[PDB]
RNA sequence: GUACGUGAAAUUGCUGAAAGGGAAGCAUUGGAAAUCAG
RNA sequence: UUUCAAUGGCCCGUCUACACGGACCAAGGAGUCUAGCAUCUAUGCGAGUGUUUGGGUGAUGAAAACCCAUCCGCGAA
RNA sequence: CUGCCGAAGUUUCCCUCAGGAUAGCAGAAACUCAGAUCAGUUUUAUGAGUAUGUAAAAUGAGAGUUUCUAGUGGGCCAUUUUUGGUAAGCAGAACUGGCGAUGCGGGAUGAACCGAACGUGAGGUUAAGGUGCCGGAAUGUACGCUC
RNA sequence: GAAGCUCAGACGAGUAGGCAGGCGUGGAGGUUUGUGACGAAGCCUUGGGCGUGAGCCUGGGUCGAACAGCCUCUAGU
């Protein structure tokens, strides 16, 4: 818009993308998250990080105490402690 | 009928009271002026010299505009806040006054003014500094919601308190608006910007100040 | 600052509100909202619900059925899945932790419902967002 | 309030407004009369008329 | 919505019966007394009110409800009044006292007005 | 309440007489040097706020009535409210027949009419 | 009226009015003459 | 409105007293568009965000509107 | 078109260059304490040899900030110091103000002299300078000098 | 006409520059049952009125077909 400007009024006057483990639990559908955590159940939930693009798993933040298998690319080195004390299962994708 | 009642019997012995109260000090000033006479007559008679007594007291008058003042004598006039030509203000006399006022020499005139010249001004040219605004003095619940703290109910108790130099004399400062005077009646001296000793109207000029005020006034 | 700079006539209904609520009463927490409601989209950082829970479930606690008031944006943190029954008044709640907040937990409020409520915001904390952006 | 300012020095209303003195304040008054004590020091005008 | 966000979107800068000057604003709205825009006198943005307004020798007010305020039909219905300018005025006062006295003193005063007009217009 | 205008003179532009180019518009002297920028004595005056008439009676006619334009029947008849304020002016471009028809409508409402006799 | 719709200014002529002894133009205040207005 | 009287009034613009431009009038006539970047304000959404490269639909007006597809960009280290 | 705010000429250094800087000023947004929190100011005490500083009484004012961002970075005039100096001026620095952006009164007239810092008016009173006439205002009063 | 009403006080030069509110022009969307051959626009005018101003309304004359107010958009303003 020309009339707003100061011309009119100067007239005159001259590849690994990462994840952290406080991000897997939000990777899942939410069905899976409503039935799977907390519930002591026989069969843990498998989260998959190389679907949503993701290279390695980094270890920022902490977990719910279900247990889970990540399956994964390549992991931090502290990545895969926490989630052995989660209960879950750490297991390296091709 | 109540609630106004009480109000308007209190507002009656607030009347009396600040009527008892300039009664005293009517009498002080009468009493005060009788005996600098008689001191005066006691010690020419016997024969011992009588001395004058220090003013506290001393009224200042800016006799020169605001062009062409150094910024040492124009940084005094703010702080004396004298920021116009024929303007006025009270400053109690003391030695940081006294030789303060020297600097501004040339540029300001003051004396020694008596109850009259003070009691004028704040009838006819007393404006007071309400919530930083130049609120006249047309009454007197004015002057008490700015100084009841200070035990200051009306204008005569002002007076007092300023011509009698109070320990609160600080505290009306900021309550009373510069006195914004007129040129003055009959003009000044044919060459404004001398001395008072020199012919000239500027500088401590005493018992001829009053004067002045009375014109500029 | 003496108006809001946005043209919102919603945002300038709760201008008017409280304007009343600041000159008519002296609860100062109506004059911090006003000069709150006055500042730019970038003063008025966002909140998080886990930024929230944890000043409410901090230390002593003292949180209690205290409603928090934040004037802002109260954004959702999925990094928490465990979300306490929280009271909030803000501008604006994102449709994530609107969603959060009712499922599991207790209620959102609009700042008109929270002058209807605690016209003199007591026992409210005036929260904050994180001015560093 | 207050449209117009009146001096008390002109305006006697305003004054019984401003004093609740003037009523009665008696401004002359004899203090001396028929007696006065000429009084000035025998040596002050020695003094005086010296030099 | 509700009244006060009508008033801020039509009030203060668009309407039909809105008429803008050099200065000043005027309310041409059938249904308003004072004929002028504030919250208070507006038609379109306020709940009922009471006008009224000429018809070939008579007069007729306008009046609203709040319940049937939805439906534009009957949102506003007339009565009619064509018996004396005096009889008018205690007709309008009397049907104003049970509601709020705010706009009386515009009312009543619209009315002689409009009767001056046959008056006026019969000499 | 009499009506009072500070100033009459318009405002001519400078050297707007000794120029068919230069208009009698007022325009703003921008040059540096100009006797007329600095206002020296004699010069023309320059427009200023301090000009600006009484809010109470500004726009007002000699008689005290501020000028409403009017177009049509309609524009008139929102006048009746304020047959003490208002003076209604008929639009240059507006028919005889109109004009006649609005300046009847204005007699019966009792609005004073500036331009009546056309 | 084909030098063709509207026909501005610069510019020229005629009539009327007024002013003018080495300029004028402009501004403020009024008088006079003309002309309006409420 | 004209004119008279008194009073005052150096020709304007530009540069640095000048000087340089100006016979008069009319029309035209000079900070524009676009890309990048940055601040600020506003609007939408919010750990997300952006569908207009593309596909569907719109025939009664169709270069619009609307719907769908997130490969990808920036952000989340 | 009107209104409002409104500098700079020298700084802060940096430079190859013109410049920027950087301030300063003017601002624009955020946030402390109702304070000894300040000051182109005075005073008192205090050491050292009226001034000096520090500290504190007077005095006026609400006083701080961190952040980004326009324009300016000249010169002239006069005062105070001031070494080289000569028929005589002249040169050298440092400082101060005024001027640039400033109209008005006065000095016959004038870039700086004397007063005075400006919205539209009415009235009153003055500054500087004047009161024979031009010219508004005493061909005033008093005492002398001068042909 | 809360973007409103009301009371009080102080203040008013201004270059580069900073900020705010307005006047005017061509075209676009919306609205005013808008104006008009019973004379639109334009043009003239010792006619009148309004605004501090940019400018605006109107009387009379000439003229002969289109034009404007308001809220927004836009620019070869």
């Known amino acids: 818009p020309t009339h707003v400007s100061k011309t009119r009024k100067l007239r005159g006057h001259v590849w690994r993308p990462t994840v952290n483990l406080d991000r897997l639990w939000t990777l899942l559908p939410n069905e899976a998250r409503d039935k799977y955590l907390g519930k002591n159940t026989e069969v843990a939930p498998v989260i998959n990080v190389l679907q949503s693009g993701y290279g390695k798993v980094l270890g920022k933040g902490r977990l719910p105490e279900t247990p889970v298998i990540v399956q994964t690319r390549y992991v931090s080195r502290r990545a895969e402690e926490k989630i052995k004390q989660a209960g879950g299962v750490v297991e390296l994708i091709a | 009928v109540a609630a106004a009642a009480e109000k308007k019997s209190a507002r009656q012995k607030k009347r009396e009271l600040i009527a008892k109260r300039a009664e005293a000090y009517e009498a002080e000033y009468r009493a005060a002026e009788r005996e600098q006479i008689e001191l005066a007559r006691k010690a020419r008679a016997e024969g011992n010299y009588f001395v004058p007594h220090e003013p506290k007291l001393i009224f200042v008058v800016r006799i020169r505009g605001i062009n062409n003042i150094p910024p040492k004598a124009r940084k005094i006039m703010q702080l004396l806040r004298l920021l116009q030509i024929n303007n006025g203000i009270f400053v109690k006399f003391n030695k940081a006054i006294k030789e303060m006022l020297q600097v501004v020499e040339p540029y300001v005139t003051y004396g020694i003014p008596n109850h009259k010249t003070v009691r004028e001004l704040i009838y006819k040219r007393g404006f007071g500094k309400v919530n930083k605004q130049r609120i006249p003095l047309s009454d007197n619940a004015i002057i008490e919601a700015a100084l009841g703290k200070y035990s200051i109910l009306s204008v005569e108790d002002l007076i007092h308190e300023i011509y009698t130099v109070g320990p609160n004399f600080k505290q009306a400062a900021n309550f009373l608006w510069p006195f914004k005077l007129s040129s003055p009646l009959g003009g000044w001296r044919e060459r404004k910007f001398k001395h008072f000793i020199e012919g000239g109207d500027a500088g401590k000029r005493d018992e001829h100040i009053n004067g002045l005020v009375q014109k500029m006034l | 600052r003496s108006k809001p700079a946005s043209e919102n006539v919603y945002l300038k209904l709760l201008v008017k509100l409280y304007r009343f609520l600041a000159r008519r009463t002296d609860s100062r927490f109506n004059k911090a909202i006003l000069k709150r409601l006055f500042q730019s989209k970038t003063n008025r950082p966002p909140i998080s619900i886990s930024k929230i829970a944890a000043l409410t479930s901090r230390k002593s606690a003292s949180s209690q059925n205290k409603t928090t008031v934040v004037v802002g944006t109260v954004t959702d943190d999925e990094r928490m899945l465990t979300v306490p029954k929280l009271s909030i008044a803000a501008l604006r709640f994102t449709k994530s932790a609107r969603a959060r907040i009712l499922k599991a937990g207790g209620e959102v409020l609009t700042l008109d419902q929270l002058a209807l409520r605690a016209p003199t915001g007591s026992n409210t904390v005036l929260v904050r967002g994180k001015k560093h952006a | ?51 | 919505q509700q009244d006060e966000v009508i008033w801020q979107v039509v009030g203060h800068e668009f309407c039909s019966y809105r008429i803008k000057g050099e200065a000043q604003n005027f309310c041409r709205n059938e249904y308003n007394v004072t004929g002028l825009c504030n919250r208070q006198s507006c038609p379109l943005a306020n709940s009922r009110y009471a006008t009224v307004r000429e018809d070939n020798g008579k007069l007729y007010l306008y009046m609203k409800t709040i319940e049937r305020a939805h439906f534009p039909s009957k949102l506003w219905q007339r009565i009619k009044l064509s018996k004396n300018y005096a009889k008018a005025l205690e007709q309008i006062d009397q049907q104003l006292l049970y509601w709020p006295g705010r706009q009386i003193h515009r009312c009543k005063q619209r009315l002689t007005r409009l009767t001056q007009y046959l008056l006026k217009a019969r000499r | 309440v009499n009506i009072i205008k500070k100033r009459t003179k318009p405002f001519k532009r400078h050297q707007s007489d000794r120029f068919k180019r230069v208009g009698e518009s007022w325009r703003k002297p921008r040059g540096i040097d100009s006797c007329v920028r600095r206002r020296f004595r004699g010069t023309i005056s320059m427009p200023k706020i301090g000009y600006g008439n009484n809010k109470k009676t500004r726009y007002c006619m000699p008689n005290g009535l501020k000028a409403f334009l009017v177009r049509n029947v309609s524009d008139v008849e929102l006048l009746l409210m304020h047959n003490k304020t208002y003076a209604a002016e008929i639009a240059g471009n507006v028919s005889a027949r109109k004009r006649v028809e609005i300046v009847e409508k204005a007699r019966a409402l009792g609005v004073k009419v500036t331009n009546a006799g056309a």
């Open chain 4, 1 to 51: 309030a207050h449209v117009q300012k009146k001096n008390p020095l002109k305006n006697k209303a305003v004054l019984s407004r401003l004093n609740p003195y003037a009523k009665a304040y008696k401004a002359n008054v004899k203090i001396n009369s028929e007696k006065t004590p000429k009084a000035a020091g025998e040596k002050f005008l020695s003094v005086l008329h010296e030099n």
